[PDB]
Each structure stands twice: as C-alpha cells, then as structure tokens.
C-alpha cells in the first residue's frame with residue numbers, strides 16, 4: 426500500500442507529501458524545493474515539487490528525463506534519488522511528481538564564500554567533481570550545465586553534482602558558445618576548469634556579458650584557434666568569424682594564475698584546452714598528480730549503462746506521462762546502509 430499523505434501550503438504552492446516527511450521549509454524555487462526531516466531514516470532531505478510536469482510534450486519529456494536520470498545515479502558524488510512519489514492513486518489522476526534527495530549544506534559559491542579557498546580544499550572539491558563526472562560520463566551522459574550552483578556541498582566538504590537547480594554562459598565551453606552540434610563529454614571538463622579557476626583565485630574566470638564577449642574573454646586566455654583546430658570547424662561563418670578577429674596567443678597559465686600550486690596550474694592547462702579533442706577527460710584528470718592524496722583507482726567507479734534511446738522518440742504528452750508513472754511505480758528505495 427501507498428502510505429499516509431498530508432496536505433499543506435507553502436508560499437504560493439500546495440504540497441501533498443507522505444507523513445514520513447516533516448517540517449517542510451522552502452529553500453529555493455522547474456519546481457520548488459523544501460528542506461524536510463525524514464522520519465524513516467532520521468536525515469534532513471530535499472523534496473522537490475515539479476512545476477506542471479506535464480504542461481506540454483517538452484515538459485512531459487523533461488519530467489521523464491529527470492526522473493530517469495536521477496533514478497540511475499548511484500554514486501557518492503552525484504545527487505541520487507532517496508524517494509519519488511505522487512499523491513495520485515492511479516494513472517488517470519497522476520498529475521504531480523515529487524523528488525526526494527539528500528539535503529546538502531550549501532552550493533559552491535555559498536560553500537566557497539571564503540574567496541581565497543585553501544589549495545587542499547580545492548583539491549578535494551575538484552577531485553570529487555571529477556569523480557562524479559567520471560561516473561556520469563561513463564554512462565554516456567553529459568551534464569552540459571556545470572557551474573557553482575549545480576554543486577552541492579555539505580559542512581564536511583563532501584560534494585555532489587546536481588542535475589538541475591551567476592550566468593550559465595560563464596562556465597560554458599567555447600564549442601557550445603559557437604553552437605557546435607557534435608561536442609563531447611569534455612564540455613563538462615571545461616566547466617570544471619572554470620570552477621577550479623574561480624576557487625583558486627576568488628574571481629569568475631570568464632564573466633562574459635553575452636556569447637560574443639564570452640568567447641572574446643575565453644580566446645584572450647587560451648589563444649585563438651590554431652590551424653589544427655580551424656580545419657575541424659565545419660561552419661563557414663564560425664570559421665570566418667574566429668579567423669577574422671585579432672589573433673591572440675595562448676597565455677602562460679603560470680603567469681595568469683600566479684602563486685597557485687604548479688600542479689593546479691598544470692591541470693588547468695589540461696582542462697582549459699580550446700580544442701575539445703585534446704581536453705583532458707574526467708578519468709585522466711583523476712590520475713593527475715594534483716590529486717595525489719585522494720586518487721584511488723579501485724574506488725572511482727563507473728556507471729551501469731544508461732538507456733537514453735527515449736531521447737530520440739517523439740511521443741504524446743500522455744505517453745511521456747505514463748512512462749513517468751511507470752518510473753515512479755517501479756522505484757526501489759536505496760538500501761538503509
């Protein structure tokens with residue numbers, strides 16, 4: 426049987442959650458989230474109410490996607506699903522979805538408010554991001570939106586990558602700025618690079634005002650593409666644009682990041698490569714000397730394969746809705762261990 430629910434109202438939204446969750450308290454409003462106490466395990470949790478999960482085909486599919494992703498993630502440094510529930514008793518009345526996950530202290534701008542964050546602290550936080558990224562990437566998933574607010578950190582400096590929930594453009598790979606279609610997983614590595622840079626210096630590495638400015642600032646540090654990179658660019662206007670602007674040489678990263686651990690500077694050089702074919706991967710970055718104290722090859726697991734064939738399907742709202750319902754139904758709680 427499904428358990429006992431109770432209703433209430435928080436800000437502008439109704440909330441119908443199991444009695445198992447208590448002391449709901451808004452924390453930030455894709456949907457709004459409450460901190461709650463979970464009576465069954467004794468932990469504080471985050472409960473997200475999806476906003477009109479089935480508003481359109483695009484919403485319906487997004488809802489399905491997020492549920493499928495969150496159900497698959499089982500790794501210390503990736504946000505995972507504690508619970509998913511609807512008040513609804515049947516598919517006919519299935520209208521709301523709530524997701525339950527660990528409540529973590531802050532996110533990375535908040536958890537890194539001490540501008541000059543320690544080098545040992547950056548090691549451990551970046552290590553953990555890369556460990557989560559290895560796992561995510563191994564499933565053929567690209568995050569695409571890595572940024573400080575997508576990194577949840579508790580008081581112990583333990584980090585989890587959040588799927589969803591300071592401009593996005595600031596952490597965005599330049600191939601994406603340029604609207605390249607066939608980017609790879611290393612767009613996330615670029616973002617880690619920008620994050621690490623910001624943690625080591627206290628400043629946003631590339632605070633572009635828009636996509637043009639963003640590129641300009643990026644090229645300023647890493648240099649304008651060489652002939653090797655240019656010859657891989659399939660768009661004429663893109664090729665002509667970057668070939669048109671003033672040719673910057675790559676800066677010396679040791680000079681730009683003065684006094685930072687030389688190993689951190691070296692990793693940054695490997696992450697912030699303009700050409701994504703030459704960018705370091707998550708797995709490679711974890712073996713980098715900079716993570717000497719943390720890197721353990723037998724405890725950096727990969728994910729079970731992840732079936733995202735659904736992404737190429739065009740279905741009706743009710744079909745996505747029902748697939749989502751099946752996913753809510755078949756959810757097996759993570760073990761109390």
Ligand SMILES: Nc1ccc2c(NC3CC3)nc(-c3ccccc3)nc2c1
Nearest residue numbers: 599600603604605657658659660663701
């Ligand atoms: N193998 C590759 C490697 C890198 C690439 C890149 N990135 C460079 C920062 C500009 N950009 C583009 C591209 C293609 C079409 C339109 C706009 C951009 N392609 C790339 C192909």
Ligand SMILES: OCc1cccc(Oc2ccccc2)c1
Nearest residue numbers: 471473524526527529530531577
């Ligand atoms: O520290 C902010 C935060 C931590 C953990 C979860 C969170 O939002 C959620 C909550 C449930 C599912 C997906 C994301 C936000």
